[PDB]
Every structure is written in C-alpha cells, then in structure tokens.
Amino acid sequence: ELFTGVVPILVELDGDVNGHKFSVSGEGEGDATYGKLTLKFICTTGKLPVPWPTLVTTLVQCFSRYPDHMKRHDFFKSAMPEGYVQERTIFFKDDGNYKTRAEVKFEGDTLVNRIELKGIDFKEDGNILGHKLEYNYNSHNVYIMADKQKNGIKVNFKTRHNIEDGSVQLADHYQQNTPIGDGPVLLPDNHYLSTQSALSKDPNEKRDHMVLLEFVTAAGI
Amino acid sequence: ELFTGVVPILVELDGDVNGHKFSVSGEGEGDATYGKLTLKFICTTGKLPVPWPTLVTTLVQCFSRYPDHMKRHDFFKSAMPEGYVQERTIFFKDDGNYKTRAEVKFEGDTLVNRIELKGIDFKEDGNILGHKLEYNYNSHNVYIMADKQKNGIKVNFKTRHNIEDGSVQLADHYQQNTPIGDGPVLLPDNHYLSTQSALSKDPNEKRDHMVLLEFVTAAGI
C-alpha cells in the first residue's frame, strides 16, 4: 500500500550543459494504480539553456501501471521505500550526450527524485543548443531486462523528438537501476513500458517552466 | 468571444467498417485560448469493432491555439457559429481506408461534431481488424493550405500508430473543409498545427470507451 493511492512527487535536478549551469525543481503527483503522472517544472535559475523536451526522460518509473498478472515484474516498486539509483547516458544523434545519476526514494510521504546531469559535446548549431526542438512529445517503448549479477535492471530505449522543420531528432538512452537497500528485490522477466506524454504551459506561471502529463503502463507478458 | 472561454463539445459518429456497424458518442470540453481538449468517448453499440486510436482524428480543429499574430489564419473559428463541413479519406498503409463526412457547427452553447464514417477493404489479418494497435498516440504536424475556388482549406498530414510488436502503422489523411454559411471566411496562408494527444481509461466507466486529452497549437508563421 505504498503506491495504492495518490503520491506527492518532488523533483530536483542540477545541470551543466557545455558550461551552462542551471536548476529545475518540480512538483506534482502520481497515481500508479492508473499510471498517471502530473508534474510542473520550474527552472529555478532563470531561462533553461536547453529545450524542455530533452529533459523529460531525466525528470520516476515506479508510477507505471503494472497490470496484476505482471506484479512480480515491478522492480521499481519492489525497491521502495529505500529506493534505487538510476544512471543513464543519453546520446542525441549527431550531437552531444547527457550523463545523469539520480536517487529516487521515499522521503516521508513524498517520492523524491534528485538528479545531477552533465551534458557535453553539444553543438551550438545543433538542434539542442540551437533550440530547434518543438514543444511536444511522442509515445515510446521502454525495454526492461533483469541485470543478474548487479541485482537490478538494464533499461534501454530510443526517443523521437520533433523539430520545427518536421524532421525528428533521435536520442539513444542507456539506463541502469540498482536498489539502494540491501534487501531482496524483484528481478523481472523481459518486458516493456508503454509511455505517452503531453507538454503544456501554465497560463498563470511567469517563470520558465513545463507542465507535463504522462501515462505509463507495463506490458509484454 | 465565441471561443474565449471553455466550450462544451458533443460528438456523435455513426460507422460501418466492413459491415460492422457501430456508434460512438462523446462529451468533453475545449479551451481554445489554451488549445486544450478533454473528451470522453463511449461506444454506444457495445464493443467497438476497430481500435480506438484509429478514430482519434475523425472524432474539432477550431480549438487549436492560434497565437495572436496568426489570427487571420484561423479558418476554423472564422466559419463559426454556422460551421464547416469536414470530409476526409484516410488510407491506412497496406490496409483499408476510411471515408468520413462531418458537420461541425455550434448548436446552442455546445460545439457539435456529427460524423458518418465508412470503412472498406480492411484486412481481417491486418492491424486494424486484427486489433494489433497499441493504445496510445504520438504528435503530428497538420499541414493547412487555402483552397481558393472552393473558399476553404485543404489539409493533409500522416499519422503514426504504434503496434504492440514495436512497429508503426502509418495512415495518410486527405482532408477538406468548406464553410456551411454563405458569409466570408478567412482563407489562410500555408501553415501547420502541432498536435499532442494522450489516451486513457475511466476507472469508473464500465462501457467501452476512450478518454482523450489533446493539446493543439498553430504554427509556421
């Protein structure tokens, strides 16, 4: 009954992309019984130096809806409340790469996601820094696998980002998750997450931000 | 001030796909000042004989957010309250094709969308009838153009539908809109609509349905 209701989420990221240091904080809530996510991200340092969509995947998979015949496959919630560490290396096709380490654990009643992001090799004439990315998101398949020795999961998927000239900027994600606690955790069979996201703005918010709605459900078994 | 607030939407579709006759009714509301859409679709005849996502585009572009420097390009709202007729022919790659005629006009305080859909040539071993389509949606670009002689717009875009085996079912849309009223209407310059949609289910709804959230904003000028 940790995720049986509506859970408050808090997100804090500190980033450095090509020297441009910045910070983002996010508040929202999630309902795992429905896989729904609702978060609001404010750039606490002023203007975000990278497109808001490139940070969607970095800014809580434990809120996925795992139908009941797939519950022994839910590593994410099996690691709670102590948590898990999520590390990734994201390669944006023909551009830079992000490196992120995050700790997501319950801190009281709130599920917290703290991250450190470092981006490098970003072209100034590229879509990322050139801010050529459109403000929206598509649906992707997130493929999971149990990582035996490490006692975790290896996740890996590709993301499609639309550019204003119609084209699509692809981003290769290489992900890993290992629990923080020393207790046993569910290693799952191979399977995937089906995610759908929609970005918008708050009509009454003055600060740079992104409003994100997201629906994620587990599948493949 | 027709679309300056929150407008109640009502949708009614009658369909025939390969002989399978069915009906859908939808209620929701839209806020054009924000391009937000929120609708709930119930299949009034029982079980929908085609995947719910193949009907998203058929089931109200006048709710698009048109930034203010693009207002003379908003044909959709320039045709109100009398309305416009939307006709389409949608070709699903290597499968059948839908034909739809719809009338969308204001009937009182409610913006109404009545449609007649006819689908044919659908493979039973195809993704459509074989119900192999995943329950989600991506973002697309809807390209508009003024149709001179006809006094309307010719719209045309392609849609991507994810299948459960990862792959993507493409759908080619050929669209036309002509006002119903005899009064002048805004013909616009070439431009496009950026749409994002997310599908979900009502936890308390027993009947076959689809819950859709959508954000659309105009761009290209």
Residue A135 to residue B198, Cβ atoms within 8 A: no
Residues 6+ apart with CB under 8 A from A108: none
Calpha distance B20→B129 (Å, rounded): 11
CB distance A90 to A97 below 8 Å: yes
Output the six-digit token pair for B46: 């029982």
Report the residue from A139, A166, A214 with minimal CB separation from B137.
Answer: A139
Superfamily of segment(s) A1-221: Green fluorescent protein (2.40.155.10)
3-state SS of chain A is CCCCCCEEEEEEEEEEECCEEEEEEEEEEEECCCCEEEEEEEECCCCCCCCHHHHCCCCCHHHCECCHHHHHHCHHHHCCCCCEEEEEEEEECCCCEEEEEEEEEEECCEEEEEEEEEEECCCCCCCCCCCCECCCCCCEEEEEEEECCCCEEEEEEEEEEEECCCCEEEEEEEEEEEECCCCCCCCCCCEEEEEEEEEECCCCCCCCEEEEEEEEEEECC
Domain extents for chain B? 1-221
Q: Under the phi-then-psi rule, with left for phi > 0, alpha for psi from -120 to 50, and beta for the rest, what region is B220?
A: left
Q: Quickly count helices (H) and strands (E) in chain B.
A: 1, 11
**The one-letter amino acid at A120:** I
Residue A81 preceded by cis peptide, ω within 30: yes
| DSSP 8-state symbol, B52 | G
Q: Which is it for strands A36-43 and A20-31: parallel, antiparallel or unpaired? A: antiparallel
Residues 6+ apart with CB under 8 A from A76: A61, A62, A64, A84, A177
Calpha distance B70→B186 (Å, rounded): 11
Residue B102, helix vs strand vs coil: strand
Beta strands in B6-151 (DSSP E): 7-17, 20-31, 36-43, 84-92, 97-107, 110-120, 140-147
Q: Which of A15, A22, A10 is nearest to A46 (CA)?
A: A22
B87 to chain A nearest CA, in Å?
25
Output the six-digit token pair for B217: 């904003």
Q: Under the phi-then-psi rule, with left for phi > 0, alpha for psi from -120 to 50, and beta for the rest, what region is A165?
A: alpha
**The one-letter amino acid at A219:** A
Q: Which is it for strands B209-219 and B36-43: parallel, antiparallel or unpaired? A: antiparallel
Calpha distance B172→B211 (Å, rounded): 24
Output the six-digit token pair for B120: 């044919």
Calpha distance B160→B145 (Å, rounded): 22
Calpha distance B173→B158 (Å, rounded): 6
Report the residue from A162, A198, A203 with minimal CB separation from B198.
Answer: A198
B179 to chain A nearest CA, in Å?
29
Output the six-digit token pair for B92: 């699903």
Resolution (A): 2.1
Calpha distance B28→B12 (Å, rounded): 12
Calpha distance A62→A9 (Å, rounded): 11
CA-to-CA dists, residue A26 to A14, A20, B42, angstroms: 12, 20, 35
CB distance B53 to B70 below 8 Å: no
Calpha distance B42→A74 (Å, rounded): 31
Q: A130, exposed or middle or buried, with CB in 10 Å at 0-12, 13-18, 19+?
A: middle
CA-to-CA dists, residue A117 to A98, B32, B63, angstroms: 7, 36, 37
Q: Enumerate the residues of chain B whose CB falls inside 8 A of the CB of residue A203.
A: 33-34
